[PDB]
A paper describes a structure:
To complete the cycle, the protein is reactivated by switching the guanine nucleotide state from GDP to GTP in a process stimulated by guanine nucleotide exchange factors (GEFs).
In contrast, the addition of GDP and magnesium does not disrupt the complex between Sec4pV29 and [name]. This enabled us to obtain crystals for the ternary complex Sec4pV29.GDP.[name] and solve the structure at 2.9 Å resolution. As seen in the other two structures of the complex [name].[name] the average temperature factor is very high (66.8 Å2) which reflects the high flexibility of the complex. Superposition with previously solved structures of the complex [name].[name] reveals that Sec4pV29.GDP.[name] shares high similarity with the [name].[name] complex bound to phosphate with a RMSD between the 353 Cα atoms of 0.675 Å. However, due to the presence of the guanine ring the loop β6-α5 adopts a conformation that resembles the [name].GDP and [name].GTP structures. This complex most likely represents the intermediate state of the nucleotide dissociation just before nucleotide release. We can predict that this difference would make magnesium rebinding to the intermediate state of the complex more difficult and together with the increase in the affinity for the nucleotide it could explain why the GDP bound state of Sec4pV29 can form a stable complex with [name].
Author numbering:
A (entry chain B), C (entry chain C): 50 to 140
B (entry chain A): 19 to 65, 69 to 187
The structure:
């Protein structure tokens, strides 16, 4: 159109290039951030995986202990039933 | 002065029934049927507190049950002698173990229900499996209390012996 | 001369740009790749706490269920226990 088509296209290209060069400097820092998230998430992954037995042990401890205590207290009163079902009996 | 021990094998083998009998506490409950785990603590005198996992090995808590392999100081690989396919299913357990097992944790075989006698496996056929794998062997009855307290006592020795190598 | 210089400055930046379009395309893969990995590390930690929340409700519902049973039967005995002491006083 023709020299202005040029002068102008070059100017357009110049700004396409600066947009593109920025988006590159920006995706590079986007990745390093996304890296920090990745590593930190794989640390969590791992951390929990280790901590879990111990955590779960602790639930079982308590669960068993809860039922034990409840069960002993019943039993102890069957012993009471026994002893006085027989305090009466012979007598 | 703790030690971590875990049991391993199929349903019907007799692993509930072994743990039940090793630890003589009747007041304790059994979740092994309802949820699919149980966990007990028996103190024993060697000259040391045990802690023992048991599992129905189903999918539902597979992620956690696995966590026991990682921290387990001894594994007990258990088979039925009345059942032949349980006696063979053992190596697929063994690789399953060492892909998860912390390398330096110690293992042991167990041939159970010697008691019930439509017994397919011999004792020497049992050490035929045990030999290759580089791991100690015992057989027991859970019912009649044969070698039960040994199973655990021998295993814990090996582990205390292991600690002091380094 | 200037018309020519422009022509080839255009050509230079034309590729200088084409290069960024490449370096963007690749950097966007690399992040989606990094985010793939970080999705997986979150993916499993959920899976896990799902199981741990699942256990904790269940084990504990189950223990209380058993503790109800103990108490339930303990009270039933306690009833018979009184009934018997009420006969011990008669004698
Ligand atoms: N005859 C016999 N039966 C056993 C012995 N140990 C366990 N059992 C039985 O085998 C069945 C399943 O055992 P269990 O302990 O539930 O196996 P687990 O699923 O590996 O724990 C039950 O009916 C037990 O009573 C044993 O030494 N002898």
């Amino acid at each position: 159109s023709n020299y202005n088509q040029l002068k102008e296209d070059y100017n357009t290209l110049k700004r396409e290039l600066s947009d593109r060069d920025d988006e590159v400097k920006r995706l590079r820092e986007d990745i390093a951030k996304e890296n920090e998230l990745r590593t930190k998430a794989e640390e969590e992954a791992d951390k929990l995986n280790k901590e879990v037995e111990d955590l779960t042990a602790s639930l079982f401890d308590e669960a068993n202990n809860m039922v034990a205590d409840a069960r002993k207290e019943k039993y102890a009163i069957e012993i009471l039933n026994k002893r006085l079902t027989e305090q009466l009996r012979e007598k | 002065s703790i030690m971590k021990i875990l049991l391993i094998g199929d349903v019907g083998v007799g692993k509930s029934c072994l743990l039940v009998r090793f630890v003589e506490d009747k007041f304790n409950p059994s979740f092994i049927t309802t949820i699919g785990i149980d966990f007990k603590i028996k103190t024993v005198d060697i000259n040391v507190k045990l802690q023992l996992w048991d599992t129905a090995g189903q999918e539902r808590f597979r992620t956690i049950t696995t966590a026991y392999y990682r921290g387990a100081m001894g594994i007990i690989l258990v088979y039925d002698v009345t059942d032949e396919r349980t006696f063979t299913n053992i190596k697929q357990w063994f690789k399953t173990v060492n892909e998860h097992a912390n390398d330096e944790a110690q293992l042991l075989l167990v041939g159970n229900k010697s008691d019930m006698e439509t017994r397919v496996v011999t004792a020497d056929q049992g050490e035929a499996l045990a030999k290759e794998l580089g791991i100690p062997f015992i057989e027991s009855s859970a019912k009649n209390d044969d070698n039960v307290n040994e199973i655990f006592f021998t295993l814990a020795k090996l582990i205390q012996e292991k600690i002091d190598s380094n």
